Amino acid sequence: SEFMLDFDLVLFGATGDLAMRKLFVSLYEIYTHYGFKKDSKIIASGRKELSNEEFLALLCEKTQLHSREKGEEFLAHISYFCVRLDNPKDFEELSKIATKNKPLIFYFSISPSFFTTTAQNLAQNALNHANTRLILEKPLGHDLKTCKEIFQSISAFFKEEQIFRIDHYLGKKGVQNILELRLNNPILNILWDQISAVEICVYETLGVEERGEFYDKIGALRDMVQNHLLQVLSLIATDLPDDLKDLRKEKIKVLKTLQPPKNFKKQVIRAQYQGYRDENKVNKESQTETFVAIKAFLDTPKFKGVPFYLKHAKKMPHNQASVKIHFNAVNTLEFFLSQDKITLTLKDHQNPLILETYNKQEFLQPYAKLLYDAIQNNHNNFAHQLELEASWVFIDTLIEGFINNATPLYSYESHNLNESEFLKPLYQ
Amino acid sequence: SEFMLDFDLVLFGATGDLAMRKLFVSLYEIYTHYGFKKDSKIIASGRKELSNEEFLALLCEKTQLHSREKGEEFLAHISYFCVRLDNPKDFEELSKIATKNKPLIFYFSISPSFFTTTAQNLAQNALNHANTRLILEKPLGHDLKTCKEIFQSISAFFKEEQIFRIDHYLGKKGVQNILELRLNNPILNILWDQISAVEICVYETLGVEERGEFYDKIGALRDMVQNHLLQVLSLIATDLPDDLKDLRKEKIKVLKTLQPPKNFKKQVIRAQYQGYRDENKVNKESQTETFVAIKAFLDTPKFKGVPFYLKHAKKMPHNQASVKIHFNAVNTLEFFLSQDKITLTLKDHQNPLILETYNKQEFLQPYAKLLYDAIQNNHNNFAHQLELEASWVFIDTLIEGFINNATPLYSYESHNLNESEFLKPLYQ
Amino acid sequence: SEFMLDFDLVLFGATGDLAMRKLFVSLYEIYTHYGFKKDSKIIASGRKELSNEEFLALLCEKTQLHSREKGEEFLAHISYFCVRLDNPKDFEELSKIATKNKPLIFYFSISPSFFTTTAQNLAQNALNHANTRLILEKPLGHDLKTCKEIFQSISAFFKEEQIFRIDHYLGKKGVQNILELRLNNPILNILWDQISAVEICVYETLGVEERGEFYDKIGALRDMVQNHLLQVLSLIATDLPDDLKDLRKEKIKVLKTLQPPKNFKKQVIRAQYQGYRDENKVNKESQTETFVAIKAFLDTPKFKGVPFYLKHAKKMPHNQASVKIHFNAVNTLEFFLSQDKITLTLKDHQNPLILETYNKQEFLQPYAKLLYDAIQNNHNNFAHQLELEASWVFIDTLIEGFINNATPLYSYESHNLNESEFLKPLYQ
Amino acid sequence: SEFMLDFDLVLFGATGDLAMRKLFVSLYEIYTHYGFKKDSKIIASGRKELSNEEFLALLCEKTQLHSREKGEEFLAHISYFCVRLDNPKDFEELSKIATKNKPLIFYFSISPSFFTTTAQNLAQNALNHANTRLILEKPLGHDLKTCKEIFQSISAFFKEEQIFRIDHYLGKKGVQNILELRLNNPILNILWDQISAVEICVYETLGVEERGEFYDKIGALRDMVQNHLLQVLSLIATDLPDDLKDLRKEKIKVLKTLQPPKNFKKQVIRAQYQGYRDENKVNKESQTETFVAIKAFLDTPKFKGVPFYLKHAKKMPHNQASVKIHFNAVNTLEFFLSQDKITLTLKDHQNPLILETYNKQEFLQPYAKLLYDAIQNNHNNFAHQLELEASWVFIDTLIEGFINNATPLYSYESHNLNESEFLKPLYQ
Numbered sequence A, B, C, D: 001s002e003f004m005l006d007f008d009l010v011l012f013g014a015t016g017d018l019a020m021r022k023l024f025v026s027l028y029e030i031y032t033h034y035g036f037k038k039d040s041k042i043i044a045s046g047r048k049e050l051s052n053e054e055f056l057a058l059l060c061e062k063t064q065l066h067s068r069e070k071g072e073e074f075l076a077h078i079s080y081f082c083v084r085l086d087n088p089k090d091f092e093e094l095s096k097i098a099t100k101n102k103p104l105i106f107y108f109s110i111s112p113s114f115f116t117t118t119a120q121n122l123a124q125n126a127l128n129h130a131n132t133r134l135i136l137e138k139p140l141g142h143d144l145k146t147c148k149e150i151f152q153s154i155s156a157f158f159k160e161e162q163i164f165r166i167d168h169y170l171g172k173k174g175v176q177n178i179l180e181l182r183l184n185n186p187i188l189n190i191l192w193d194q195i196s197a198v199e200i201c202v203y204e205t206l207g208v209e210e211r212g213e214f215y216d217k218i219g220a221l222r223d224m225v226q227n228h229l230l231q232v233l234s235l236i237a238t239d240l241p242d243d244l245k246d247l248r249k250e251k252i253k254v255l256k257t258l259q260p261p262k263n264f265k266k267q268v269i270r271a272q273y274q275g276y277r278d279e280n281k282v283n284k285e286s287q288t289e290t291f292v293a294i295k296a297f298l299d300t301p302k303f304k305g306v307p308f309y310l311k312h313a314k315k316m317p318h319n320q321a322s323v324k325i326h327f328n329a330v331n332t333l334e335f336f337l338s339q340d341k342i343t344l345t346l347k348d349h350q351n352p353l354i355l356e357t358y359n360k361q362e363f364l365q366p367y368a369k370l371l372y373d374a375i376q377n378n379h380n381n382f383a384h385q386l387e388l389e390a391s392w393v394f395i396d397t398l399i400e401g402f403i404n405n406a407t408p409l410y411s412y413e414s415h416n417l418n419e420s421e422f423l424k425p426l427y428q
Helices: A017-034 A052-063 A073-077 A089-095 A114-123 A145-155 A173-183 A186-194 A221-236 A246-256 A366-375 A385-403 B017-034 B052-065 B071-075 B088-093 B114-121 B145-156 B174-182 B186-194 B221-237 B246-254 B366-375 B387-404 B419-427 C017-034 C054-065 C071-075 C089-095 C110-124 C143-154 C173-183 C186-194 C219-237 C242-258 C366-375 C385-403 C421-425 D017-034 D051-062 D070-073 D088-097 D110-125 D144-152 D173-183 D186-194 D221-238 D244-256 D366-375 D383-404
Strands: A008-012 A041-046 A078-080 A104-108 A132-136 A163-165 A196-202 A268-273 A291-296 A308-313 A320-327 A331-336 A340-347 A352-359 A409-412 B006-011 B041-046 B080-081 B104-108 B132-135 B163-167 B198-205 B268-273 B292-296 B308-312 B320-326 B334-338 B340-347 B351-357 B411-412 C008-011 C042-047 C077-082 C104-106 C132-136 C164-165 C197-203 C268-273 C291-296 C308-313 C320-326 C333-336 C340-347 C352-359 C409-412 D008-012 D040-046 D078-080 D104-110 D132-136 D163-164 D198-205 D268-273 D293-296 D309-313 D318-324 D334-338 D340-349 D350-358 D411-413
Touching: A008 A017, A017 A052, A017 A366, A017 B104, A052 A078, A089 A114, A089 D383, A114 A132, A114 A145, A114 D008, A132 A145, A132 A366, A145 A385, A173 A186, A173 A221, A173 A320, A173 A340, A173 B320, A186 D008, A196 A221, A196 B071, A221 A246, A221 A308, A221 A320, A221 A385, A246 A385, A268 A385, A268 B071, A308 A331, A320 B071, A340 B071, A385 D078, B017 B052, B017 B071, B017 B366, B017 D070, B041 B052, B041 D221, B052 B071, B052 B080, B088 B114, B104 B114, B114 B132, B132 B145, B145 B387, B163 D104, B174 B186, B174 B221, B174 B334, B174 B340, B174 C409, B174 C421, B174 D268, B198 B221, B221 B246, B221 B308, B221 B387, B246 B387, B246 D244, B268 B387, B268 B419, B292 B419, B292 C077, B292 C089, B308 B419, C008 C017, C017 C042, C054 C071, C054 C077, C054 D383, C071 D411, C089 C110, C110 C132, C110 C143, C132 C143, C132 C308, C132 C366, C143 C385, C143 D040, C173 C186, C173 C219, C186 C409, C197 C219, C219 C242, C219 C291, C219 C320, C268 C385, C291 C421, D008 D017, D017 D051, D017 D070, D040 D088, D051 D070, D051 D078, D070 D186, D078 D088, D088 D110, D104 D110, D110 D132, D110 D144, D173 D186, D173 D221, D173 D334, D173 D340, D198 D221, D221 D244, D221 D293, D221 D318, D221 D383, D268 D340, D268 D383
Parallel strands: A008 A041, A008 A104, A041 A078, A104 A132, A132 A163, A196 A308, A268 A409, B006 B041, B006 B104, B041 B080, B104 B132, B132 B163, B198 B308, B268 B411, C008 C042, C008 C104, C042 C077, C104 C132, C132 C164, C197 C308, C268 C409, D008 D040, D008 D104, D040 D078, D104 D132, D132 D163, D198 D309, D268 D411
Antiparallel strands: A196 A320, A268 A291, A291 A308, A320 A331, A331 A340, A340 A352, B198 B320, B268 B292, B292 B308, B320 B334, B334 B340, B340 B351, C197 C320, C268 C291, C291 C308, C320 C333, C333 C340, C340 C352, D198 D318, D268 D293, D293 D309, D318 D334, D334 D340, D340 D350
16 A cells, blocks of 8 residues: 555465575565555465474574564564465465455465466465466576466466566666666767677676576576566667557567577587586586576667677676676776666776766665565566567577587586686677 | 387486486487387486476487487487485376386386385385386496395396396497307317407596496496406306307306405506596595406416406596407407407518408497397396306405505596506506 | 886796796886886896796796886896706806896795705805895795794895895785874774774685695695784784884784684684695695684783684685774774775664775885885885794694694685685684 | 619717607618618717717617618618817818718708807818708797898808708608699699688697607797698698799798788687696796697688688697698598598588598608608708798797787696687687
């Protein structure tokens, strides 16, 4: 209700990595910045049986929420309901406690292969009435077919206004900066027609660590490039809309111009870090990549011949998350995505000059802002079906190449790759 | 019959190395050379949950069968079913899919420590009726006791006709040549009485490679010498029987004449390559040998005083697989084991001469031939229990020697050992 | 003589790693910032025979000095002169070309075991006249006995004013900041009485750098902790004297209060990275540590019960070099040692505050500053004998512990250690 | 004439490795295949002093020539004469030994620093008449400047036509096959105008092997590419002359069209094997390459745009020595350099077809063929000064690139390189 919010959210996958890194803390941030109604409920759910007292202990061990300013009072809103996602009787028991009077949100912090099943088990137990909302994760499948299937199956029990395809990069301030600057600075309007190269790059120092049951079925390309980095690409390459409400249209337009590789070896490099196969619950014969670099091209006049380097990887030497928009081999406009930072690189007669603007954090982390949008029934900053489908067209090309071993699955030592040496083929 | 085969095969260990290097391709070869009935099923199994499409993607990347002539219609016969071998309820789910009307073969491409358990969980669910066949991998246990126990335990619910002890060297044309030539060439009957030394050698350039968990409990000696090299030795040294139905007997006989070392330090050399202890799932304080060489003797008159050099190792400089029968110092008959090649070395006044016969491989690789035999219920080219038991007597002697550090565990640089310099003490 | 310095320098470890990473470039920095007299000579020396052209090729490839602003003119001052281990004719030839007219500096960029011998062969050829200076490396021996021995043996033919014990941390601006701030800010005089813990930490991503022969006789503790980190500790704890000329005295004083461990296993953690034993010229069963962490205490009243954590290691995930002075659990003063950066951590209602200074690096790196000081015959920023000896008392205790396996030699994967988890026992 | 050979040969450095490994046995082969006149003399010489009887014993011990078929009849032609290369009076004494009108050949199997000296003492004692010939070993400089210096210095006593610069690949039967086939097969005259790529490759499994002191000053590029591989290239690319005495001319011509790299990163790959720096007497920080691959071009119309891949390296997985002349992407004519084997690769619908000739034989050993050519005053199979100079132009360019680190010095594991992946940059 803008503030003092009245709602229930049942969080599927509440014991997982995402829930414990970003989601409960995002809920605490929303609680401290807007307040919860006394009866707003956050019902954590998992496959193992825990008591409220045991799950609260797990949460406090993993997140340090108990030591935060309003810690005890937040954790008073949290309960645990064991749900096994396969037997509708767990969902029958869940339906006697699900409210029918306030927005009731189901968060699918689970692998996309469980989406339809879960959605079905919701509608089979009268949990899909108008007051119900679904928040589904970013990949939404592992190729175009399953994306369309999940959409088709879930639209049989839920209306559009009930489905939220979350891609938390659309809530990062760094990403929003791209379009704001493009819209409000004529100088960029002129320079965007002369871009010579784009670099969208997200490197992490972390690895997977037992999240492998699910990572090994997805891999870096689908984990981040299919959704986050391609969303960013569409924001960089879109024609500027007359009506911001037609933005969706233009984004799809540009994503449809994505070309499949003309020469796989010259345009695609993949790798897997040493020790990935020893992480728990990865097949010891796994071919899943923890590293991708792609030289992509768009068939639009404004970008004919302009390479878009898409790079993402884990167990890298340094954390990095950036968009480098290159004009002319010395001048580059950089938008940092994990910080509100913008940089322009200029060259003097001797060395480079970096111009910078920086600001501190909003304190509303991207997920929190989006979860707030969801509690308000605001769809503007969520991913749209046709965007995801065009993304999948391109990504499916690249995956087909991986299966044909069209470029080798290289190896690299954790925290010790030399990225520039490793990717020279792409930049030649 | 010969063509159009009717059968279901459940392949335990379908994500393992053997499954992906030789087995599925062997099934493809059978498929293209003989045909399957449309509803004959190849059910790959492993312990992680995968989908049919995800397992097929893994298989198609590691083997490229999709790109073969009838690849897609072959893959149409393959699906994946998760069975965790530690969970007996997974075996209840299995056998809801087990056929009762056609030959149903369970392939244990798994470590021998799982044999008994699995067999019991099969017999525990009425999966041991007459139409069922068991294929048990080359290491039958890790000593005589466990070999006997595995056999005794499985015989309780499975008849002899239902258990197949696979040793794929028995399907190699090079290995078959030894016994064929000995049986059909009197010249060898006479030259066998003047053999001066035998050399059985299997060197690989590859290493354990993600099989460390299994390898570290087994080691080179049991991985290859207990079964392959000793089968070959028995084929060289067996008295040729008057009636061939007795060949089995004679093989056992010669294996029983294997002598324990009279002086361990002078008759056994063991070693481990640099980097082995750092492999995934290997003990850093491991004493497991990746290299073994043995000077063995037989207590039978025809070979009194004749050294049999048994050599096997990984991460060697070149691949090699041979049997050298030295008759004297200038005349030597070599059977190649991975080629249909035989050579005889003679001397003229000035130069050395090599008489050679080379024929190219058959379309069917050894595992394909033996799997075809299994689908036909043909046991002739499979290993027999008592052969394995005698082999274990000899090998157990050597292993106990390894436990007492009776000869040191040397080190060698991967791919850089100097085999002749390293083994000069052995040949003197 | 601030400018256009007249000097000859013989650099003994001239083909080694230190010479090629930091020293020749340091001489170039001095050359561009002060100028050389035309006849000032830099005589690189090593044990292998090279021509001037061949050494110039090696140096220019490893350093790219020729492409620098004044590169070719600087290189014109450089020649190569072969001098072999304890070779009387090479030292005779060396003294046949040595000037008697300007300061002649011998730089021992070699291993300490070769210092006394070299010094003897220097004095044995009348190369110990007044115009001669010896610059000795950081490790002055490998224990107190050998430190005293090298000093005694060299002091027989060289006067003290000819001996320069170089410890290049004393030329780091970050290191100097500690003592300058302590002397010029009473606020720190007051806060030093309530210190709760000190943390001196130097982590490198690099490893032995093909210097195994030397490293395997020394190990991390003596390589860096005996000299650099203990100098830093002495600078942190120095009772600030009324007269600065007593500073040396006071430094010795605190170093002598270092207590040997109360419990070796609880106060000392050592480790060695995987693959170290496979490095060139390292013992395959070596016990040499590439990682140390020590919880030390001083038996001085101002620091009763205050832990000094000394940590140093190679093949780590990130480079780090800092001193954290913790006054309480929320207030920490951090001196960065490789950046002129100082930090003070304060607390707000909920959040943390960081006060910071940063200044860009000086154009002279520490070895350039110290070499310049040496050409000026200025000893003030060089290490003193008794400081090193007091350090050796403590270090020898710890080495004695290492030999008796008083704490286990753990293993860690290069670049992939988790430092906080690994050392939690140490901080309890 | 062709047969009974009338000559005197003074073999300088006759006690060296080349003399005892390949020269005396080659002289015996020439003796048995063509015969010596009874008064033809083989005068072994060196600075040391010996009697005929003692040197003959030495030769025999090392070579077993006395136990060869016609051994003593050959040994009777051999005597020792002591010559101290710095003493002209010894050269007067040899003048009395040389017959004055027959061919007198001096073999300079000595270090190049003595050449000039010796040449002088030959002209100083009237040992440089027209009937005199000089045979100079391959190493004659490490760049263009030193090449010219040696030439000018020696040319003041012998004319160009008196000098035979040995490049022992020109005596390899496989190498001669190139020009024989090109001269005697019109079909190649047509196909040579349509070559699409050439590959000259020499890989060895051995390393530097005790010769490290010298190798580290030369490196793979100068050791083999500057002389052997570029001579082979010239034989491939020369226009065929009407008169063969113009062959050298044409060879020079084509070599002068060698282009320096347009893009160093794309055209040059260099590397050094792990353990090289640890070979005895190799620099601890050496940048010398043990592996090179160069994509070179000629600015001549018949080969405009055609890449010549020149590859040579040590400690490789397999020995190889070949010329692959690619006519299109499917058809390739291969000359083996150490076998007398020629291959033509064709394609049928499914597989490749290899047409072979293999005449395992022994035309003459390379140094025997070249020594015979020298005694016959035939220069076509010896290098000409300008061939060397053009070669050095190109090679010196590449060396300058190495010094500027224009492409990195990669590392590789001995006997375990994956050559096709490693060189993807060159062929992409």
